[PDB]
Design an enzyme around this catalytic site. Sequence first.
Site, PDB file in Angstrom:
ATOM      1  N   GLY A  21       3.641 -78.440 -91.957  1.00 51.80           N
ATOM      2  CA  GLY A  21       4.503 -77.902 -90.880  1.00 51.80           C
ATOM      3  C   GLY A  21       4.502 -78.638 -89.625  1.00 51.80           C
ATOM      4  O   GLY A  21       4.172 -79.668 -89.442  1.00 51.80           O
ATOM      5  N   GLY A  26       3.396 -81.940 -82.716  1.00 57.72           N
ATOM      6  CA  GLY A  26       3.954 -82.704 -83.892  1.00 57.72           C
ATOM      7  C   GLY A  26       3.621 -82.081 -85.241  1.00 57.72           C
ATOM      8  O   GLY A  26       3.627 -80.981 -85.488  1.00 57.72           O
ATOM      9  N   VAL A  28       1.712 -81.390 -88.873  1.00 56.12           N
ATOM     10  CA  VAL A  28       0.262 -81.255 -89.824  1.00 56.12           C
ATOM     11  C   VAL A  28       0.177 -81.791 -91.119  1.00 56.12           C
ATOM     12  O   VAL A  28       1.427 -81.099 -91.820  1.00 56.12           O
ATOM     13  CB  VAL A  28      -0.130 -79.855 -89.490  1.00 56.12           C
ATOM     14  CG1 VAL A  28      -1.407 -79.548 -89.956  1.00 56.12           C
ATOM     15  CG2 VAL A  28      -0.316 -79.423 -87.860  1.00 56.12           C
ATOM     16  N   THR A  86      -9.745 -81.336 -89.355  1.00 50.16           N
ATOM     17  CA  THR A  86     -10.649 -80.301 -89.641  1.00 50.16           C
ATOM     18  C   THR A  86     -10.682 -79.617 -91.324  1.00 50.16           C
ATOM     19  O   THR A  86      -9.769 -80.484 -91.900  1.00 50.16           O
ATOM     20  CB  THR A  86      -9.871 -78.908 -88.843  1.00 50.16           C
ATOM     21  OG1 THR A  86      -8.868 -78.530 -89.493  1.00 50.16           O
ATOM     22  CG2 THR A  86      -9.980 -79.207 -87.489  1.00 50.16           C
ATOM     23  N   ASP A 133      -6.422 -69.045 -74.672  1.00 54.19           N
ATOM     24  CA  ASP A 133      -5.165 -68.897 -75.606  1.00 54.19           C
ATOM     25  C   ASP A 133      -5.152 -67.869 -76.845  1.00 54.19           C
ATOM     26  O   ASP A 133      -4.618 -68.461 -77.725  1.00 54.19           O
ATOM     27  CB  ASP A 133      -4.038 -70.082 -75.570  1.00 54.19           C
ATOM     28  CG  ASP A 133      -2.754 -69.566 -75.741  1.00 54.19           C
ATOM     29  OD1 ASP A 133      -2.250 -68.572 -75.526  1.00 54.19           O
ATOM     30  OD2 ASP A 133      -2.012 -70.604 -76.123  1.00 54.19           O
ATOM     31  N   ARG A 137      -1.307 -65.909 -83.686  1.00 54.84           N
ATOM     32  CA  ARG A 137      -0.504 -67.427 -84.283  1.00 54.84           C
ATOM     33  C   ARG A 137      -1.510 -68.568 -84.296  1.00 54.84           C
ATOM     34  O   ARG A 137      -1.093 -69.660 -84.653  1.00 54.84           O
ATOM     35  CB  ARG A 137       0.465 -67.499 -83.339  1.00 54.84           C
ATOM     36  CG  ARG A 137       0.198 -67.918 -81.674  1.00 54.84           C
ATOM     37  CD  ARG A 137       1.426 -68.382 -80.620  1.00 54.84           C
ATOM     38  NE  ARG A 137       0.818 -68.099 -79.322  1.00 54.84           N
ATOM     39  CZ  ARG A 137       0.652 -67.123 -78.294  1.00 54.84           C
ATOM     40  NH1 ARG A 137       1.085 -65.764 -78.656  1.00 54.84           N
ATOM     41  NH2 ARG A 137       0.318 -67.306 -77.359  1.00 54.84           N
ATOM     42  N   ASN A 138      -2.575 -68.224 -83.445  1.00 51.87           N
ATOM     43  CA  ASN A 138      -3.816 -69.446 -83.299  1.00 51.87           C
ATOM     44  C   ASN A 138      -5.080 -69.185 -84.378  1.00 51.87           C
ATOM     45  O   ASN A 138      -6.009 -69.640 -84.136  1.00 51.87           O
ATOM     46  CB  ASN A 138      -4.474 -69.409 -81.855  1.00 51.87           C
ATOM     47  CG  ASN A 138      -3.234 -70.180 -81.219  1.00 51.87           C
ATOM     48  OD1 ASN A 138      -2.416 -70.854 -81.703  1.00 51.87           O
ATOM     49  ND2 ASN A 138      -3.138 -69.784 -79.874  1.00 51.87           N
ATOM     50  N   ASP A 151      -8.025 -73.805 -82.358  1.00 55.89           N
ATOM     51  CA  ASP A 151      -7.503 -74.465 -80.874  1.00 55.89           C
ATOM     52  C   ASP A 151      -8.069 -73.906 -79.821  1.00 55.89           C
ATOM     53  O   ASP A 151      -7.353 -73.949 -78.704  1.00 55.89           O
ATOM     54  CB  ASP A 151      -5.806 -74.148 -80.824  1.00 55.89           C
ATOM     55  CG  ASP A 151      -4.801 -74.887 -81.808  1.00 55.89           C
ATOM     56  OD1 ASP A 151      -5.410 -75.655 -82.490  1.00 55.89           O
ATOM     57  OD2 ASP A 151      -3.728 -74.567 -82.166  1.00 55.89           O
TER      58      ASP A 151
END
Length: 271
Positions: A21, A26, A28, A86, A133, A137-138, A151
Amino acid sequence: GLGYGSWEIDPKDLTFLKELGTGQFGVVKYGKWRGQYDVAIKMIKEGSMSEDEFIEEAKVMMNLSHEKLVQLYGVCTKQRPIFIITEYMANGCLLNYLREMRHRFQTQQLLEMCKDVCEAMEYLESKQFLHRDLAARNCLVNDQGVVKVSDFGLSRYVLDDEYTSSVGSKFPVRWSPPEVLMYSKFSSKSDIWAFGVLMWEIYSLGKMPYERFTNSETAEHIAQGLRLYRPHLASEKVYTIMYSCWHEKADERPTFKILLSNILDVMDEES
Ligand SMILES: *CCC(=O)N1CCC[C@H](c2cnc(Oc3ccc(Oc4ccccc4)cc3)c(C(N)=O)c2)C1
């Protein structure tokens, strides 16, 4: 070897297989380390990060270790673009997974996703480390269905001003407490507020919070003292837990240790 430091990975040791994605930094990718171990590789686009500052922080992050925290293998920095490495999380981001209706989740499964994230956040709180954050979504999901936090801390090193300030058009307004929106006061208790909003996203199967309002209209609702309300799949005991994260006064919100206690008690009572 000569003379890589303990945080530095040799890019010659990577094999690239498939594109996953595109994010804000940028691309991944999925690949293998030394022909054998699975990995994800995040490639940072030029001009987007404070790179010297991030590298110094990567040394500290390497020493964090918990089963519900995504594990950092290292960084490639004697080049450009720099890479972050990771473990591979086969089932993608939590937000997309919740929205797939084919899973037909039981409420017992949704409570275990909340427990997974609470365990990770208790660990970070024990080391005085803020996420800054937290949101669906994270978070990421592995091949066995286990949820992990990722993240963490990363927003500190982003250069694009749209994401960095309360006025900014890309700031996370819908995950922020009153004292952040009015005065920019960040603390362990702004991470607590965001966790309660994450419980709401899980029990609503991925709906956008305050779905009928703009960011501007949401900030005004919050300052008049109004709140999100109870998702159809949440019991009265579960709603009591998520609501406790939104007290107008910061010092009256709970700690991550107390929230984890509250979640184990409901698991024992409802199953
Ligand atoms: C909601 C859609 C989405 O976001 N994804 C689906 C496509 C694949 C995306 C993905 C992104 N990253 C990723 O692995 C990494 C995550 C973070 C990272 O940097 C940091 C920085 C600071 C602390 C921790 C980590 C580097 C890589 C994966 C994956 N592991 O499979 C997937 C998610």
